[PDB]
Design a protein around this ligand. Structure first.
Ligand code: CL
Ligand code: CL
Ligand code: CL
Ligand code: CL
Lengths: 154, 155, 153, 154, 157, 154, 155, 154, 156, 153, 154, 154
């Protein structure tokens, strides 16, 4: 059916998003700078590692549904909807970019969970339901770095 | 049992209640901290909070080991505690200052309460306070450092 | 709004976890009799599982751009579970625990439905996972109240 | 309610299926042979152990719902709908049988999750939703062994 | 033949013993799930712990057959046909569960001593050793269970 | 000094008490019976193991003070002040005996800490101060088993 | 034209990008492998993939330690890499053949790049390549064995 | 007196031997001295700990045979046939004493294994058969310390 | 037991120890030289079973010391004492497996015989050592034999 | 002030831990003879226990609103233990170690009393705990100097 | 002097440097202050710990070459070329000092690796080659703290 | 190239040396005696285990270079240049022999690293460079046992 095919389409996009989001996190991990270096270097590795784990989950979900994941490295940027990071960025800009990307993924996961549910694919709906919570945690952490008036440094 | 044994038991109830409120305060700071120091402070509050947390059971069970009862009814904690339960929206600086003030109260009380235990010949309870107070002194030091200025990088 | 309603549920659920945990600590400390070690452990074990839910429920509020309950004075004002009061027999502790678990189980089913209606799949999932632990705890506790084992009842 | 009684009926069937499926896996583990022995001996133990873990989960779910699990050993083959393995089998046949049984369980778990959901039993629906993904993984692994044209041995 | 009979007999013992381990394990799970009353946590754990030790024996006994160029019991429908332990039936009190477990353990202990002797006669030192090791676990389980049935502790009996 | 030789006398008695108390616990561990078997079997092993750890601590404290511990096995019952367990006992009797012995040890450790303090032996005072809290825990646990009116079995 | 910092940094960018592409290739093989060798090969590809994966951070952070920058923009990886990104449906034999070819390219480049680093006096970078190349040599050996025939059991 | 009663008699003696042998090892551990101190302090603790583990095994074996272990602390020296260590000893003398006691236990375990075998008690025979190998290891280690002509210190 | 018989148990331990050393080295050969589409699976099999044989070397050697004897120790002595066939020349994977089975069968036979000898000597510990170790060899033999079976329906 | 008397003790004690640790490293590296492995290990093990005290003693100063010794040039100015000098026999190393441990034990007893009189129960406790480790080390070392073992002395 | 005695000279200097650099890190760990306290307290301990591990490696390298390491505590400041930290410093100053010392050590390790290589001492060359990379990591981390324009706090 | 095939010859010799050196260490482990027994029994096992690990590294290096390791057990003593231990030895003689063999291996590893470097085989050069350091450690340890004038036992 087209709903089942639709589910496979969501998994490819979601998987590609996980790959690009992970690579973005590595960029921030490597290129972060300033007095917050150790803290942020760690933040980006930690949240990056959680996104990383999703790559294999989303890819193998396609296989479990008798489909194929994205696999050719050249295909990732063709199917991803997350923005691949480009150019020199300030730490503030890295965090802003990460939040925007997380918000896109969160919106997509809710949409994709609904598609899976309509397809009767309770497993894929559950996968998205679990993974979206990690994104919501990442978004919260990142947003806090952007708050001011802490009375110590902002 | 004796009047002095009852006084030791009274100290344990107050100290236990303080550990509970102090823990819950740390959770507030953990959850509500914000700004560019978020990850570092989020962890700090969880780490120190966890160390205070461990004291709850130690102080409570000490009462039992002395043939008494700990504070146990949730409604009693705020009636017995002498530390200030955190109230309202706070800046991170305010959280840290509040934590220091509460730690200083606990430090003072633990020194007083160790002396009461010692007077009662209760070497175990005196030892408990003597060990735990050192953790409070560590927490106080960490927190006070966050309030220092002139680091040359961000203050 | 359904989204504001979700946040309201999280505050109540979080406060319930805190009170439920503190209740378990009371049972842990005050249990007595020939079943002491077994029950002392039971109360700690189930207490520890309830404890873990406090942070989960609190941080869920933050992830939804809200705030958790945080002021210690607010917990007993928001909680719907009964905070334990006065001297209790072991049987009474267990009965109280079951009643509170049953309230939480009912509320988590209600609150999962509210989250689902709001489209908040994550919060619905949180309640769906946590309620199973409460259902386990309820079963364990209920078994202690059964009679006719042929050994001691 | 009658729906809640229905949920308990599903749990007994599902639990019994877990037991029979596990014992089937042990058969394959023990009786597998040929040049793929170590690889398949391990596969059958690994997937068998994941099915095994489900036995206690499905049984205790009945208790948490104020019911009783299947418990009398004589009752398992009376309640289970999966095919208990019978007779001497080739490795190919073992894999084919396993896939068929997994597909039956997958079908049943989707049906049973919907029954639980209609009963308002979110916990049981979730249990089936989580467990079915493990079955889907097992099915995919097994199906891969049956593919040909790898260019090395088939 | 006279040459192969003892080894054939050893294989027969392993199938029975393996089948007994499976039924005994499943019995333990019944007790684990269905136990009740003020001893719940303690006994819930006991049944799981002893059940887990019996469980481990299933693969040991099954693979022993393979190591002797035979085959274990494997078809699920065969287990109850080959087992000599009583598969648990019906609603039981906790006392009844314990008594049933003891009786089954005693049957297995007797059989393992008999089967060790058969293996020893066959010159099968490995299989005799397997039974010799496993029977001690059954003896431990039997002792634990029997203690629960003692009275006059002064606290609850 | 004389007070230093007095401290050494306390350590020999305390060490011997730990040995006898440990062996008493092993008796209770082995000979406990009835419907509380697993729980009490574990209790006696757990508390026994904590008493056990004290043997080496108390023995080596003597060496650290340029003295010698009790060492000849025949000496332990000559030096110990705790009652070595004798004869067939009910579980209730075992627990009552254990409590009485713990209370003797608790009393002695307070006395012996005072003796150490008077001698300026802060280390030995500290040893007793730490160990006595474990005895107080053990006493509490044991006393609880003797309480009645739980509403379930007493 | 360029500083010796720059030539070494150029090598690290290419090597880092190669590690990323090689890793993603291994994931393709991991996911798309099939046939009676599935479990064995599924594991092989994950294991060797994981070892290549670990190199990404090492090679990237080496650039930072040399006061340079790694490749970081995801769009840049395929523009800098010299290994062939895997394309289209492949048999298992073809996956293994492709992997060997890519490993051989990397092994050649790492020897060249170690020499460049050594000439620049960059003993650390030379050492990094010297260590990493041995893992590639192991992977190549493993892969090559799968292509051998005449085992007497299945080939 | 049946050979089953005889088996129980052997277990009580062997259990008591384990207790006394362990306490002897503790004496050697505490009282060793000289330039070999750390090495021998560790040896005595290591071999002592392996003997220690036998105490519970031998005691609980009695229980599994529907008997009772030695349990009253005052009974151990009455039942044991190993020599309890007496008086100040040189390190050489401690080692010689340990070897002699190990050789007694080794002899007894062979005798006791035969008694168990004659009783049809395959489990108890096995216990002695396993434990005796540990004693044989200990004996070997100890005997090596007594050898001369190493060319470094003897 | 007579001196002759005690010496005979010691002789069995030397042979058994030397066999463990050669069997181990044989397994390393198979580990290193295995090839073909089963490479990873067999590379691991040979290492796993080799590692279990390896562990036996120290057990069998130290058993001699515990009996007031000496193990084989001079490297030149191993091939003089061992009765298992040291692997020789280029072999197919099938040939490696066949060789391993034959050697395991020899060791299994010897361990049963040597357990009898130890039992006759009253040496219950040595009899036990052989009784335990032979089961590992029986497991290894089973695993290896399975690789030689045909008609799996997938690759044979 | 009495606050500064306690702080004075902590600086001396901290400096002593640093010097004592470095001494242990010398013994670890320079020990020789047929007891090599055993002594190499002994010196590392006891050295490691002394090492752990450095941070405890330094941070205690910070917890009392003071500062620890920190400038590396200050350690030998503040320490009262003898820094090891020149080539030594193994016997001499052990003798030197015992002497320094005895000095530290004496000082910790004195310094515990100073803290107790200042009402600084935490600092008194620190010294009370650490001195027991020194007492253990002293015992171990002294045993190596005993004779008449019947095997090698 | 011979190339061999030259290598030993380098190890003494390098070892002494490791000791002084470690003690400097402890100063920074203890005396750091301000709103970055936890992050920097940890950084200094982490990098300090990695420098610490080098002390034994460099010292024992001397022994392996039939020489002797620096060992007299009074010798460290006489042999080390790194600047021992002196006086009250701001956090910025601590980081600047650490970078300068790491840069000194990095330069020296490259020089000393070349000396070892010329001596044919491949082991010592390798030791320096490995250790210098840790210093290069530490230098990078520290330099990042000194960067400005992150958009959050600088 | 000619240097390339030469590298393979070095690996065969080195691998064979690791096997013989390991078997030598086992001899010393088993046959060591006297009052230093535990210490030396451990030393020989510890250093033996480190030599043991080199066997697989050196063998598989040959495979990674498209060659073959030594593998026929009969070939080891034909290819090894280290002296296989022969006859009854004093502990002193065991240590002296071990040192001589280590010195041969250290010499050869330096020579073989140079050969690999000439061949452009940076991996094999590195392997030798790493392994030689372990041999240098073992040599140092062993040499220390031969020193006299410790003031305690020599
Ligand atoms: Cl952190
Ligand atoms: Cl438990
Ligand atoms: Cl595997
Ligand atoms: Cl050691």
């Amino acid at each position: 059916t087209t709903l089942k095919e639709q589910v496979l389409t969501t998994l490819k996009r979601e998987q590609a998003n996980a790959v690009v989001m992970y690579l973005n996190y590595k960029k921030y991990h490597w290129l972060t700078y300033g007095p917050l270096f150790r803290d942020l270097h760690l933040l980006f590795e930690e949240q990056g590692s959680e996104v990383f784990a999703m790559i294999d989950e989303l890819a193998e979900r396609s296989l479990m549904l008798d489909g194929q994941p994205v696999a050719d490295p050249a295909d990732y940027l063709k199917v991803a909807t997350v923005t691949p990071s480009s150019g020199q960025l300030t730490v503030k800009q890295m965090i802003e970019e990460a939040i925007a990307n997380h918000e896109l993924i969160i919106t997509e996961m809710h949409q994709d969970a609904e598609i899976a549910t309509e397809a009767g694919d309770i497993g894929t709906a559950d996968l998205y339901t679990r993974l979206v919570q990690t994104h919501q945690k990442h978004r919260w952490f990142l947003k806090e770095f952007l708050a001011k008036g802490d009375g110590l440094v902002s």
